[PDB]
Amino acid sequence: PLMVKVLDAVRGSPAINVAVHVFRKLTAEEEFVEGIYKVEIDTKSYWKALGISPFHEHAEVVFTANDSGPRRYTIAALLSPYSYSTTAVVT
Amino acid sequence: PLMVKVLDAVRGSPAINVAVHVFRKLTAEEEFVEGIYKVEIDTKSYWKALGISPFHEHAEVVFTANDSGPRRYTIAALLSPYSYSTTAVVT
Amino acid sequence: PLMVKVLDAVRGSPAINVAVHVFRKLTAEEEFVEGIYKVEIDTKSYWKALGISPFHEHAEVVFTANDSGPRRYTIAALLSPYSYSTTAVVT
Amino acid sequence: PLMVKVLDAVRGSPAINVAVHVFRKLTAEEEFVEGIYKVEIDTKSYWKALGISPFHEHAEVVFTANDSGPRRYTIAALLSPYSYSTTAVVT
Amino acid sequence: PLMVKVLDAVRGSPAINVAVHVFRKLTAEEEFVEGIYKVEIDTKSYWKALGISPFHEHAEVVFTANDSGPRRYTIAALLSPYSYSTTAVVT
């Protein structure tokens, strides 16, 4: 038999992030688990998958990508649970 | 038999990040687990998978990528749970 | 029999990062586990997998990549849980 | 029988990073575990896998890569849990 | 029988990094464990695996790689857990 037990006896105030997966057995994607606890911050996709036969003949492409500007990412305890703690963001 | 036991007896206030996986047995992706606890910060994808036969003939491409600008990433305790602690971001 | 026991008796306030995997038995990717606790910071992918027959004939490509600018990555305790500790980011 | 026991008796406040794996038995990737606790900081991939027959004939490529700019990576206790400690980032 | 026991009796506050693996029995990669505790800092990959038949005929390639700029990597206790210690980054 297959028995999976997680956190059966929890008495006092834990701060938990639980992810349990149990198994039993142009772009192709099948039978997967992706990004259970995923945090994407300032992630840029410019040209992902244009198509079949793009810019086939006599293509004059001027691709200019400029990501240069005042951006502030102030994060306290990302993906970090806590208890009996003090988290503060002061500006 | 297959028995997996994780954190059965938890009494007082732990700060935990739990990931349990139990097994039993152009781009192709099958039967995988990806990014259970994944943090991507300032990750850039410019040309991922344009397609089949791109820029096939007489292609004049000027690809210029400039990522150069004022950006501040201030993170306290990323992927780090805590208890009875003090986390502070002061600017 | 296959028995795996992890952290059965936890009494007082640990700060833990748990990853348990139990086994039983152009691009191709199958039957894998990737990035359980993965932190990617300022990771750049310019040309990942353009396609089949790209820039096939008479290609004049000027690829210029410039990643040179004011960026600050201030992280305290990345992938490091703690308890009874003091973490502070002061600017 | 196969018995694996890890951290069965935990009484007081440890700061732990646990990774347990139990076994039982163009690009091809199968049946692997990658990056359980992986931290990538300023890792650059310019041309990973363009495709089949790229720049096949009469290719005039000027590849210029410049990664030269003011970047500060200030990290305290990366992949290092602690307890009863003091971690501080002061600027 | 196969018995593996790790850290069975833990009483007071250790700062530990645990990795336990138990066995039982163009590019090809199969049945491996990679980067359990891996830290990559300023690691550059320019041309990893372009493809089959790249730059096949009459290729005029000017590859220039310049990684020369002001970058500071200030790390305290990378992959080094501690307890009853003081870690400080002061600038």
Swiss-Prot record, chains A, B, C, D, E:
Phenotype for residue 18 to M: In AMYLD1; amyloid polyneuropathy
Designated gene of the protein: TTR
Compartments it resides in: Secreted; Cytoplasm
Tissue expression summary: Detected in serum and cerebrospinal fluid (at protein level). Highly expressed in choroid plexus epithelial cells. Detected in retina pigment epithelium and liver.
High-level lineage: Eukaryota, Metazoa, Chordata, Craniata, Vertebrata
Impact after mutating residue 29 to K: In AMYLD1; amyloid polyneuropathy
Note: Tetramer dissociation and partial unfolding leads to the formation of aggregates and amyloid fibrils. Small molecules that occupy at least one of the thyroid hormone binding sites stabilize the tetramer, and thereby stabilize the native state and protect against misfolding and the formation of amyloid fibrils.
Name of the molecule in the record: Transthyretin
Sorted UniProt keywords: Amyloid, Amyloidosis, Cytoplasm, Disease variant, Gamma-carboxyglutamic acid, Glycoprotein, Hormone, Neuropathy, Phosphoprotein, Secreted, Signal, Sulfation, Thyroid hormone, Transport
Organism in which the protein naturally occurs: Homo sapiens (Human)
Keyword Secreted: yes
Pathological condition linked to this protein in its record: Amyloidosis, hereditary systemic 1: A form of hereditary systemic amyloidosis, a disorder characterized by amyloid deposition in multiple tissues resulting in a wide clinical spectrum. AMYLD1 is an autosomal dominant form due to transthyretin amyloid deposition. Protein fibrils can form in different tissues leading to amyloid polyneuropathies, amyloidotic cardiomyopathy, carpal tunnel syndrome, systemic senile amyloidosis. The disease includes leptomeningeal amyloidosis that is characterized by primary involvement of the central nervous system.
Result, substituting residue 75 to V: In AMYLD1; amyloid polyneuropathy
UniProt effect for mutating residue 55 to M: Loss of tetramerization
Record carries keyword Signal: yes
Full protein: residues contained: 31 to 143 of 147
